[PDB]
């Protein structure tokens, strides 16, 4: 999102002289020259390369009408136009021109901006300079005079018996510009050529979860087919596993229609660059996954799907905390299947026939009450059952809980065992990704326990003070609990940049600022100056904020609550909605002192300004010291005594002066 | 707790003119005029809108006795009145004035405070302003003149045929007044109309822990009575749980009558609110929760009392750890009781009559002893065996243990297992928050072993120095060890506002300033601009403070202790109790030098201010440099230098002179 005029024009555009255009009044420039104006065409910045496209300046030759109202005149009018305007360039000559204007109208809808293409020729058509006439100088050194618009494209000899092709492409190229070059202050598309699916689409994300959901389809489903040797015959399952793979082919097709995530900056959506990415980096996995036992096996490659791209998914919430069990079922299942075909190889006899007495399955049967039958060896316990079975066996082995109606006791079965059990023993490990949750938990206990002992330990060191202190002290820690749980106003800030912390600043208070009919006239120069500044405090009542205890060296205004003032123990100030105290500091220079015993009366919030950092403002922003200086109404000055008369004492001193 | 005038000030009340009247003496105010004396009423303030109640200065007009003593007399005299003052308001004329006072005392007993209520109307009885006389500028145009007290409540024309209600609501008004603003400078009630019970009152947390005790027995006892299918026919049982659910409404009644959370504030107990909040919130289960096998089961829903208020009373102490294991018994007596119906759904035979010799109960009634016999199918074990048998099982599950003599056989009991399995996998792992005090021991061990490591490794890396040394720094790492365990004096200081924080600082000391005869005449303001500054240093012996060394830097006193100063090898002071060394600064400016190898002698305490931050605190305190500049007794000045006497010397050094 910008106004679009250098993210992809360093590699495409062409030379140019790129004007800016985007209302002026003044005099009117032509600033930067592009692709082949770097010093060898013309000025440098400051000067008509920056400025002043007005054809002047780039000069040094006679004054003719055929040299001066060519193209300096049918600049801002963008129709069509092919003149000769002199413009100085490095061959000392009286430079005509060629070109092929193309226009464009603005994206404000204001009539601002112009495409403004040149080409900027000298030698084509004539170079009638005579500084020196030693033959060859003008008239055959015409191929070496000018390095610019030539050495764009064709290098060569103008006329060099290709006229027509160096004639056609700096006379008129708008076939070749135009929308090569990128349009407008349209603020532009995120890079978006057509036919390429953006990896934050709608339509992306979806598709990852679908195929993640048929993933966790084939892991589970693909090795129970492969142990128990169920009959393949049927009908449901027959065509959803064909549907499964050509949804798999269709994502292999459509990755190539994806944008590729650039290294370190934003989206990367070349047409060619995605493919070989893909290509070298994970095509291989997905040809092998998506084309007898072993071919129905080696499909659990697919997983290499979900570890590609586990990133975009791993917190979308609480997330983890079901990653983590689906690994264990998809493991459990598994050891289950694999301890099942163990069981299954025991039995059969190890050819012959002579049932083994020792293998689990027999003891399965013995145990569940079905036996086994020669007819040739048939009958015993159902599918459902045998799985079920062994799923419960690998369940006791990996939550290292054990049983022992099921266990092993034939050799292989022992070998297999003490494997499980390794690698059990790791998993579980693994499992804690839950205990930091139930860690965050068992933190909130640990910090409530360390309150409770940060509570009585102040107490006690305190070698004992009036209750009433240690009152105060517990108020106010729970209470500055319970408006700060957890994050501060600090950390928050200082990871902020210079511009976008003072925008936080700025919109954190909004109460004197957006409320107090003072700060009215400034849009976003002076508050942001000022705004940095206030510190919003949360008064506790019973407070002395200013009393006689310390200098005033503060501004403060009151937003939520009320103030009381006492003057030697009687009152006339209890403050109300943007109401001010402390001595003002802008037409005075001059200092007040602990006149006062403020009290504190609700929970107010209060803004306060150092002394230092307000008068530096305003002295910045003089302009601003006449709609600050006179639009705030003083409730109560701490600089001059108030004056207040009592009712209950002059009542009886003339009382007491009839009897004197 | 407050003086109380605006925290429900700003929603109720209206129109008035409120005064302070808190003592006085001098001229006496009126301050702020309140509910519609923004701009367009009165002046502002510092002025008859913020002083001089006398009724002068809005006066604009022609002095009439008619217009001076009317209100101006009878304001501190408060009886009852309807006279016409002479107030100047917008409309520019001799503004006649009606009103109603309602009168009040103080709360100091002192007569001090009076409501102060103003009606402050012009418009009713009679304007006689003669500014221009264009017909209907003051004869029709009274309608228009004043927009204050007649934008109020009535708004339309003194008469407009409804003159009584105009003329009585205007006239006397005290009936909508007196108890209607809030009260004195009694320190309020904490927002507490009649019959609303506060969230923190004694009452309403026994409640909660009666209530908690019946959630848990009916957690406990529902789920038993709905799978052990017990005879209901009882006596004590048969009535208790009725008491239960009829406590359980009585709560339910009582939520409307007890204060709300504010938003981050205080209580919230608006009659109204709290009725709509609870509806809203948590209304709805508790109706359905305390309304066949379902509706005795759907009981289970009260767990929600639980749930929301868990925040009160999870860190009353060491909760946490018994939280864990209640919930842990739970768990477990659930999963027992459905256990145990599983196992009952199995036998019976699944239709027909034939004892399954797979389902763990025929397992357990073999083992016990009692067999199952047939009449139609009765006797086995008892009901007490049977429960705690499930009980048993559940336990061996979810603690990890496992026996086998009582496990899983059928195929049911094996689908119920695994899922069983991984719950308890997840719960073990929730377990842990008994490891965090766990944890804090364990961490008391780590912090143990890592001093271990600290005094090894600097010994080692010391390249080896005089053992002293590290004797020394060992005994000193110690002892700052057990005067400060843990918590420190200075990051609890960094959490304290500016003035709580010199409180603390101020009533830390409190050894020189209410122990040394020289701090008695500072009330708080002196003090605490020193108290600070002083940093109290626990001295140790055999140290060197201010030896030849160093420069003087620092006044000096001492508490608890006693400090030796050398003088070139030889002695004059041992100090005693509030002894002072050091050179003085607040008669001299000039500085002192090292001068002395003053040692420390016990374990002493000392108080120390830097130079920088004690010369200016007199210097503000300049009344104060009497108090605590003649009534310092100076103990030994590092500035002179004393004078004491050999006794071993000069009796040797005359032997000396008479063999010579």
Redesign the interface.
């Known amino acids: 999102p910008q106004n679009t005029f250098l993210e992809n024009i360093v590699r495409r555009s062409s030379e140019s002289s790129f004007l800016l255009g985007n209302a002026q009044i003044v005099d009117w420039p032509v600033v930067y020259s592009n692709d082949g104006f770097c010093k060898l065409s013309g000025y440098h910045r400051a000067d008509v390369m920056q400025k002043s496209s007005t054809c002047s300046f780039m000069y040094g030759e006679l004054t003719d009408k055929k040299t001066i109202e060519k193209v300096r005149q049918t600049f801002d009018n963008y129709e069509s136009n092919c003149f000769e305007v002199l413009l100085y360039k490095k061959n000392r000559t009286p430079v005509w021109f060629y070109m092929q204007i193309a226009p464009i109208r603005n994206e404000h809808e204001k009539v601002v901006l112009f495409l403004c293409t040149f080409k900027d020729i000298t030698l084509f058509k004539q170079p009638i300079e005579d500084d020196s006439t030693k033959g060859w100088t003008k008239f055959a050194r015409l191929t070496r005079a000018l390095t610019n618009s030539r050495s764009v494209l064709q290098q060569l000899t103008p006329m060099n018996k290709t006229e027509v092709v160096h004639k056609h492409s700096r006379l008129a190229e708008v076939l070749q510009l135009g929308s090569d070059i990128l349009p407008q202050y349209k603020q532009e598309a995120p890079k978006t050529p057509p036919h390429i699916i953006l990896h934050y689409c709608a339509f992306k994300t979806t598709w990852d979860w679908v195929i993640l959901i048929l993933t966790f389809y084939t892991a589970i489903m693909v090795p129970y087919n492969v142990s128990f040797k169920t009959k393949q015959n049927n009908i449901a399952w027959l065509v959803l596993d064909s549907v499964v793979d050509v949804i798999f082919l269709v994502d292999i097709v459509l990755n190539f229609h994806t944008t590729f995530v650039g290294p370190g900056g934003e989206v990367i959506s070349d047409p060619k660059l995605i493919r070989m990415n893909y290509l070298k980096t994970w095509f291989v996995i997905d040809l092998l996954s998506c084309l007898f036992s072993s071919l129905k096996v080696v499909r659990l490659l697919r997983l290499g799907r979900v570890a590609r791209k586990l990133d975009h998914y791993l917190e979308y919430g609480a997330a983890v905390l079901v990653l983590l069990?689906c690994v264990?079922?998809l493991v459990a299942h598994w050891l289950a299947c694999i301890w099942y075909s163990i069981g299954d190889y025991e039995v059969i006899d190890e050819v012959t026939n002579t049932i083994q007495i020792d293998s689990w399955l027999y003891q399965l049967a013995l145990?569940?009450?079905t036996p086994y039958r020669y007819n040739i060896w048939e009958g015993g316990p159902s599918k459902?059952?045998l799985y079920?079975?062994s799923?419960?066996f690998t369940?006791?082995s990996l939550?290292?809980?054990?049983?022992?109606?099921i266990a092993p006791t034939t050799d292989v079965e022992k070998m297999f065992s003490v494997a499980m059990m390794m690698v059990g023993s790791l998993l579980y490990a693994t499992?804690?990704g839950?205990?930091t949750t139930?860690?965050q938990?068992?933190?909130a206990?640990?910090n409530?326990?360390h309150e409770?002992?940060?509570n009585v330990?102040?107490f006690l060191?305190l070698y004992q003070?009036p209750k009433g202190?240690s009152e105060?002290?517990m108020d106010?820690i729970v209470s500055?609990w319970?408006?700060s749980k957890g994050i501060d106003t600090e950390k928050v800030l200082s990871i902020c940049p210079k511009d976008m912390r003072a925008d936080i600043c700025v919109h954190l208070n909004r109460k004197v600022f957006n409320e107090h009919p003072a700060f009215r006239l400034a849009s976003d120069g002076c508050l942001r100056a000022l705004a940095v500044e206030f510190q919003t405090?949360h008064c506790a009542?019973?407070?002395?904020?200013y009393?006689?205890?310390?200098?005033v060296d503060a501004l403060c205004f009151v937003v939520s609550?009320?103030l009381?003032v006492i003057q030697d123990?009687?009152?006339?100030?209890?403050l109300?909605k943007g109401?001010v105290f402390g001595d003002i500091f802008w037409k005075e220079t001059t200092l007040a002192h602990?006149c006062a015993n403020v009290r504190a009366?609700?929970?107010c919030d209060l803004h306060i300004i150092k002394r230092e950092a307000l008068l530096k403002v305003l002295d910045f922003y003089t302009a601003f010291a006449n709609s600050f200086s006179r639009n705030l109404?003083?409730?109560?000055?701490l600089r001059k005594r108030?004056?207040?008369?009592?009712?209950?004492?002059?009542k009886k001193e003339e009382e007491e002066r009839l009897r004197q």
Chains 1, 2 share one sequence.
Do not use: W
């Not at 939550?399 to 109606?405: A, E």
């Not at 009542?541 to 904020?545: A, C, F, N, R, V």
């Not at 108030?642 to 002059?650: A, E, L, T, W, Y």
């Open positions: 069990v264990f079922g145990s569940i009450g459902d059952s079920v079975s799923l419960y369940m006791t939550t290292t809980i054990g049983f022992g109606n499992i804690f839950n205990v139930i860690f938990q068992m933190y206990n640990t409530r326990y409770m002992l940060n330990r102040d060191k003070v202190l105060r002290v106010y500055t319970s408006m405090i009542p019973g407070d002395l904020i009393h006689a205890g310390e200098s609550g009320s009381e123990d009687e009152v006339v100030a209890i109300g109401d602990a009366l609700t929970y109404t003083l409730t109560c000055n108030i004056i207040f008369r009592k009712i209950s004492d002059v």
